[PDB]
């Protein structure tokens with residue numbers, strides 16, 4: 001199976017998922033000087049007051065915090081988007097060391113981690129249908145830097161010891177994802193893909209400019225997770241990021257001057 005190791009990592013993925021070498025792959029480097037301010041972009045609308053978290057799952061690649069997406073409870077709209085996109089899950093990508101971990105980069109800078117809030121376009125009815133469409137998903141990406149703790153992250157951190165290994169899940173209700181946002185919703189946006197297999201070219205990416213800060217201690221607990229299943233040789237869950245891919249024929253737009 002695919003993963004992040006030496007033998008099954010990003011440089012191998014194209015052998016089973018040829019779209020890995022496609023024309024709208026993610027992540028990318030965001031060249032801040034080349035990104036054009038687009039005064040026609042809207043403020044984003046992040047409506048998470050009725051979000052219903054259900055469960056957290058170690059899927060062998062990351063951990064996903066899952067939401068009830070059976071009604072418009074937690075939705076993303078506006079910005080570059082047409083229509084309404086429902087929150088299904090969030091997850092992170094992180095490094096073995098603070099100097100790497102993000103998937104997007106900003107003028108080649110790597111952040112310690114990157115949060116992805118994954119949303120699907122309601123016009124397609126369910127997530128599986130959405131990922132087959134070029135405007136099927138909207139992923140809100142937020143960089144993490146190490147400094148002061150993020151108080152709204154600690155609930156997530158504290159449940160990680162209960163889902164150490166692949167396939168473990170735990171009940172995770174009443175978690176408010178608004179506590180993971182930065183102050184500003186200034187963003188860059190471009191058309192891209194999933195950053196893991198199957199690498200489908202179905203995402204409008206919205207990457208916030210302002211990182212959140214989390215503590216060393218919080219990230220260290222991410223790095224205690226395991227890629228392996230229970231009882232299997234321990235492989236720490238670290239460096240679960242895909243590097244930047246060719247920009248090709250795409251324009252990154254900025255919401256801000």
Ligand SMILES: NS(=O)(=O)c1ccc(SCc2ccc(Cl)cc2)s1
Nearest residue numbers: 116118128131139193194195196198
């Ligand atoms: N890291 S990311 O681009 O946000 C991300 C990669 C993978 C997803 S959900 C993966 C997947 C894709 C297709 C199906 Cl049908 C079920 C799950 S979001």
Ligand SMILES: [Zn+2]
Nearest residue numbers: 091093116195
């Ligand atoms: Zn992701």
